[PDB]
Structure formats: structure tokens, C-alpha cells
Design an enzyme around this catalytic site. Structure first.
Site, PDB file in Angstrom:
ATOM      1  CB  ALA C  57     -39.917  -5.913  -0.492  1.00 48.60           C
ATOM      2  CE1 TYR C  58     -45.414   0.090   2.270  1.00 49.69           C
ATOM      3  CE2 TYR C  58     -47.591  -0.725   1.400  1.00 49.69           C
ATOM      4  CZ  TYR C  58     -46.983   0.378   1.912  1.00 49.69           C
ATOM      5  OH  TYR C  58     -47.416   0.846   2.755  1.00 49.69           O
ATOM      6  CB  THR C  81     -33.486  -8.410  -1.940  1.00 48.85           C
ATOM      7  OG1 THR C  81     -32.585  -9.237  -0.841  1.00 48.85           O
ATOM      8  CG2 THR C  81     -33.033  -7.266  -2.219  1.00 48.85           C
ATOM      9  CB  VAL C  82     -35.388  -3.198   0.630  1.00 45.35           C
ATOM     10  CG1 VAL C  82     -35.750  -1.914  -0.632  1.00 45.35           C
ATOM     11  CG2 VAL C  82     -36.487  -4.339   1.322  1.00 45.35           C
ATOM     12  CB  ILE C  83     -30.908  -3.185  -3.253  1.00 48.20           C
ATOM     13  CG1 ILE C  83     -30.660  -4.319  -2.771  1.00 48.20           C
ATOM     14  CG2 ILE C  83     -29.309  -1.579  -2.952  1.00 48.20           C
ATOM     15  CD1 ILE C  83     -30.311  -5.040  -4.101  1.00 48.20           C
ATOM     16  N   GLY C  86     -32.188   6.311  -5.320  1.00 47.92           N
ATOM     17  CA  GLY C  86     -31.863   7.676  -6.019  1.00 47.92           C
ATOM     18  C   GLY C  86     -33.038   8.248  -4.633  1.00 47.92           C
ATOM     19  CG  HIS C  89     -39.704   3.669  -3.076  1.00 45.15           C
ATOM     20  ND1 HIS C  89     -39.768   2.643  -3.696  1.00 45.15           N
ATOM     21  CD2 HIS C  89     -40.660   3.888  -2.947  1.00 45.15           C
ATOM     22  CE1 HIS C  89     -40.802   1.834  -3.250  1.00 45.15           C
ATOM     23  NE2 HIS C  89     -41.506   2.617  -3.465  1.00 45.15           N
TER      24      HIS C  89
END
Lengths: 154, 154, 154, 154, 154, 154
Positions: C57-58, C81-83, C86, C89
Site C-alpha cells: 500500500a506504500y 489494506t493496512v491493518i 505491534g 509501521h
């Protein structure tokens, strides 16, 4: 790109079903499922079905080896029930008959359905042998069949 | 000092992918990953890819043996998903299909990718089949390929 | 008093869809939504739809810039999609690809749909990509289209 | 419907890798990953790889600008590690070097891999630079390459 | 005593499958299951399968009535997913589409498979559409088929 | 394999919208959504839209029967809001007007949109009628339209 998807009908095939009488009250449905699915769904004539009855699930292997080895049959459906108890006997039985039936497969080239319930309660077993969550016995037979035609497809 | 590092391209091998339909909703991405990585990355023509569909992950072995044995294929990518439940059925399936696919390797000399998800939840599986933590299916294929050229390098 | 309300049909204009393969298992529905909505609803011919696949996605921006810049396309639908996890990022990716796709818009004059799921769980993402709460991918396409005709209306 | 999927091989491209020596103990693996993936997988000759070493991750941008600007290189792999601490210095560094490398991309048209670990512990970083959860350095390089051919595909 | 047990093969009868696009991300597997089971298991030629796409599960009835009424088809497989939420909308939808599809049956004489997931979570639905607990979509088709031959048997 | 997917445009067909004035403050947006979507999206001329106002959501059926029956209209969009309270009056209203509008459908062959909010709070209703979670009124119209062309497609 070539794909192999195989159906569960196989009117000819002579299938051999093996069964443990221990936990009969539960293994008996397993057979019913198996046989029904075998004929009804798989188009198998009921005289190409032979049913071998060994005492315990621990014996399932030797039975299903003498069978597959024999050659007469195109697949073996292994049907048994092991419900854990006081000691880890369950461990060794369930195992020695999982790894067992597994080795019989890889050494005979004859597909073998692992129709062995390895559970914790009569509750769970009755669930997996006709009621709530299917009837592994029948499943075992269908997967048996399918595998027959799958192997055939190579 | 001579070192053997092998790349993942091999637009020449014919790879065979096997798959369990049980847990389709999850195994299907596994295939998608596998195939993509196979062609796109590995330069493999999509007609040197054949895809064999066995019922359950327990059957993956016999399939992947008939395949590797056959000889036609340079490697087999095994794809399945086993998510634990009420009983230790998971135990015997996952195991008999890990030790299974393992033995098929050492006896055929044909590399085989252990692309079998052995998890605890649909949550974990969906993580390991496309989302958060990669897409083991694809990985399995790349490791498949690499191993092809690695073995070749001796 | 003159008002500008624009519909979502636009059978001419050539739309370019960009997609991150990371989180494929989720982004894939995003595409299905997008495309369906594009043709079915937007009357777009399926050869005026080109689909560019970037890794993460970047990367969505650079892709959607080379596209819009190119000129051939009337709008770009960005799908990713970005979930979160930890570390933060997620922060930098989601951001650098929001502010990114945003800048590509204001510098190209080509509308761009922010079809990028920025969530906290696979649970939330699966909600926003087909199930409970719609299918942002499709939405992104409709807003894409509408914007085409909206800009046109000036 | 025309689709653009691009592979990670690219023989003739000259890639420039930049690296912060701060957090060397961690960034060093990042480089190992990057380079390996670059040559081994991407077919890149090791003399089309130049490696620029800037002090801190904050400097990554200017470095990767003078590089991309230069023109000689087809893509820049940015490699750094920022682990939060007592103050929100992390904030400004990680950020000014995310938005940074991001801007260098959209202004040069040269793809740039965001191979910058933005974490909370040496624990998490060691996870994301070779062990448990992959080796972002390498990933950065692959996404680098892929993007090369992707942009090329337009 | 005469007994009627019917198999699931019926390579000649034309089946119509209806589907809600809402909850696509889940209903899509439902279709995959249905179709596979239809052809593969039921011997149905893939041009005797028509697939009607209505918006929501609430619309499933009218679709499956216009179909069965039509006469061309031997059975209708109804495929949808309804997952409860904030209000008892679920109540009326799930219901009006259960009683719905039910009435369409008794008035058309055409069997109809109730392949509509009425659950509480995406978790439960994903279980009942491919993973842990089978793939109701497929099931619906088999029950569809069987019912074809059952009715025929009178 | 023939598939039926239908769009939401239908510039001919004359649509009839019915509305309960009780809960006007909420149903009024439902109408705005409906109408906008009808014309703007569905290409419907605003004189092929007639709007019947019945007192309560309980009356929606009879209204939408006299309409569909009439024949002049190609679909009816039913718009109402029922928010639970002290007693289970909500129960009988919402129900008798769900099952109601449902029966009007199956007996007239005229598609009918169940645009009736059955909630627990003004909070939830305001969410489902323009804000956070869409604008069911509009949705009801689109599904209305689509259904028009879907039925038509048989």
C-alpha cells in the site's frame, strides 16, 4: 493450466470397510453412513462392498493391510471410535492406529479413509457420527471414493 | 570455499500443486498465492502447472506421492489447512499429513512444500493465508522452486 | 440557484485501478467490488479498465501517479489494506499512502479514490470489504466515477 | 480487461541502497537481506549496486534524493531502524524520514523502498530484520525491483 | 416395504442459483461450493446452471419465484448471508426470506435450497461457508439435487 | 454458464414511494435518499415518481398493495421507521408491516423495497438514515430499481 477435480461416483470399485466392535454403539452409525454414501452416492454395488470386523481400533491397521495388500479392493474405509479416559491409553491406541492406517496407505498405494473418531466424550462422538456435526463414517467413504478417481487421474 | 545459493526462477520445471477442499474458504487463497508466485516469480508457464484436488488435508500425501512418483513433475506444492477443534482429531490429521508429505519427499527425491496451515483459529489461518503474516501458499511455492534449483546444484 | 449533482454512469472514460498484493486475502474483494461497480453500475467497458498491481500500500502513490500523469485514464481507483500491529509501521504506511494518493490528486487533476482500508483487525477489514459494512472497493469506484462527471461539470 | 502484474527480476537496472549506521547492529542484516534479494532473486549484478552510508535514519532522505536525482540508478532502497525511547524524538525522526523518503519518490519518479523499521523494542526490530517475521530489508529490495518493472509497464 | 432413497446425481436437469451480493465476501464462497457440488457431484452441465444476482437476501424470494415459476429450471438454490447487528433488522430480513423462499417452494412444486446463513458473527459465517463447519452453499445444492430426484420418485 | 447481473439504471419505469409520517423527523431523510438515488442514479424522470403518504408504518402494506395492484408502477419503495419502546407494540407493527410488504410482493409480482427501519433508538435510526451507516431509503430505491431489471431479465 490443467486441473484435476474428481467426483465421488465409481460404480465399479470394490471397496473394503473395516470396523472396530469396541464402541459399537457408535461405530455402528459410522458403518451405516459409510455404506449408504458408498452405494447411494458412489454408485457402488453392495456386493463389491465387504466389511471386515476387527475387535479394537488398534487392530484396524493389520486388517486394512491384509485387505489392501490382497489387491481385490480399490480402497479401504477404516471405521473406529476412541474416546479418551482415565489414562493415556487413548494416546497409544488412537496414535498407533492413525500412524498405522497411514503407513498402510503409503505402502499399498490403496487409498484409505481415516474414519476413526478420536474424541473426549460420548457427547462429542455422537456429534460426529450422525447428529450435529455430520457422520464421519459416510465422509470417510466419499473421501475414499474421490481418492480412488483422483489417483486414477494420474 | 564454495557456496550454494539458489534463486527462485525456473521457467522450465513442471510443478504439481495439490489441495484439500476442506477449509476451501482459506485454502483457496493458498492456491492463489502459490500459482501467482509460481508463474509471476518463478517464470513457470501455466501449463506446466497441474493442480490436483483431494478432499481433506489427510489425503494430501497419497496425492503428492502418485504425483512425484509419476516423474512428470519437478516439485509438488502441498496446500491444506487444519484448524484445531473440540477433539484431538487435528492432532492426527495435521500429523499424519506432515509426517506424510515428509516421507513422500525422502522417498521420491522430489522436493515438496509443506504449505499446510496448522493453526488454532480461523483468525490465525486468515493471518497466514494472505493478510497480516504473509501467504504461506506462495511461500510454499517459492521454497518449492528454490529447492528445485538447490537439489539441481548437486 | 444552480446546483451540480452528478450521476455514477460514465460508459466512456477509461479508469485505472491500482492494488497492493499484501493483504491480498482482503484486497482481492476490494478489486471485485471496484470492477463490478465500475462496469455494472458505471457502464464502463471492461477494456477501459486497466489494473496495476504494486507490492504494498506504500507503493500505491507512485503507481497512481505514473498512471494519472500518463493521461490515458480519467480516474484512478486506489485499493489497499493496512491493518495495525505491534509497531507504528501502520502509522507511516497508511499515512504516507494517504497523503501520497492525496497529493497525486491535486497535482494531476485526475480524481483518485482513497480505497485504502486503515483498520485495527482482520475483523474490521473483513467488515469493510464486502460484509457487514459494505465494500469500500466498490464505493471507491463509484466516488471515482461520480467525481469524473463532477469535475467535468465545471 | 488488461492487467499489469510484474515480476521481481531485472538484470540491467542499477539499484542504490542507502543505510543509517545508527542501529547498525540491526540495520546490518537489513543490508544483507536487501543485497541478497537484489542479486540472487532480482538477477542484479553486484556492481550495479551502490551502497551509500549516512549517519542517521533522519538523513536517509537527502541521501536518497541526491541518488535518485543523479539519474544513474533505477531505484533506491532506503534502510534504517528507529526504535522509540524516553522522548518523542522517535516521532520526528521516523516521521521526517518517512514523509521524507516519500517526497523523494513523488518528485523523482524513482521508486524508493521504505525499508525503515519503526518499532518499540530491540525485540520487535530483531523480529523484523531476519528472524520471526521476515527481513524487511530484503522485502524492501523486492518491492523496489517489482516497482521498477511496474512503472516500466506504463 | 417400499423405501425411497435418492442419489445426488442428475446430469440433465437445469438448476437456477440465486445470490445476494450483500455480504459478498461470504456469499461468494457459497456460490463456489454450490456450483462445484452441482457439476462435479451432481453431473450437471455448466450451461444448465444459471446464476441470478439480487441485491439483498431479502430479495432472494421474488428472484427464486420468477425463476421456479418460469418452469425452465428443475430446482433453485438460494444463496445469501445475514449476520445480526445493532437492531432486529436481521430478524425481519432473515425471516421474510426464510418464510419467503419457503412459500415459493410450496407454491411452485420446485424444490428450493435454503442456503441462507443466519448467524451472529463473521466468525460463525466464515465457519459455515467453507471452513470449520462445511460450506452450506454446496450442501444446499446437493439437497437441491437430491430433492429433484426425490420428488421425481413420486 | 449464463449469469444475470443487473444495473440500477431504468429511466423508463414509474416507481411509487410510500411513506409513514410518524417518525417524520427520520423518515424524511429516507425519502430524500430514495428520490435522489431514484432520479440521479436510476435515471428516473421525477414525474414517474409518485409519493403516497400513509399515517403509520403499519399502513405501509395496504398503500403499497393498492399501488402495485393498480399496475401503473414498476416497483414500490416502502419507507418507514419503527423504534422500539416501553411495550412490544414495535413487535407487531414492525412485523405486520414486514410480513405485510413481503406478501404484497409475492402476490403482485411487483418488487418492493423494505425501506423500514426497525431499531432500538433514535441514535440507531439516525445512523441508518443518512449518517454513519448509509441511508437505507436510497438503498431501498436502488435495490428497487435493480430488482426491476432483474425480474425483467427473466
Amino acid at each position: 493450466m490443467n486441473i484435476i477435480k474428481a467426483n465421488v461416483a465409481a460404480p465399479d470399485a470394490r471397496v473394503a470397510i473395516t470396523i472396530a466392535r469396541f464402541n459399537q454403539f457408535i461405530n455402528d452409525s459410522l458403518l451405516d453412513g459409510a455404506v449408504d454414501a458408498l452405494t447411494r452416492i458412489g454408485q457402488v454395488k453392495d456386493d463389491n462392498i465387504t466389511v471386515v470386523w476387527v475387535p479394537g481400533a488398534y487392530e484396524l491397521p493389520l486388517a486394512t493391510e491384509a485387505l489392501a495388500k490382497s489387491g481385490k479392493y480399490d480402497a479401504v474405509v477404516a471405521l473406529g471410535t476412541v474416546i479418551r479416559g482415565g489414562t493415556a491409553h487413548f494416546e497409544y491406541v488412537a496414535g498407533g492406529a492413525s500412524n498405522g492406517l497411514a503407513s498402510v496407505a503409503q505402502d499399498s498405494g490403496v487409498p484409505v479413509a481415516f474414519g476413526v473418531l478420536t474424541t473426549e466424550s460420548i457427547e462429542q462422538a455422537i456429534e460426529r457420527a450422525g447428529t450435529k456435526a455430520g457422520n464421519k463414517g459416510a465422509e470417510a467413504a466419499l473421501t475414499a471414493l474421490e481418492m480412488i478417481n483422483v489417483l486414477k487421474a494420474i
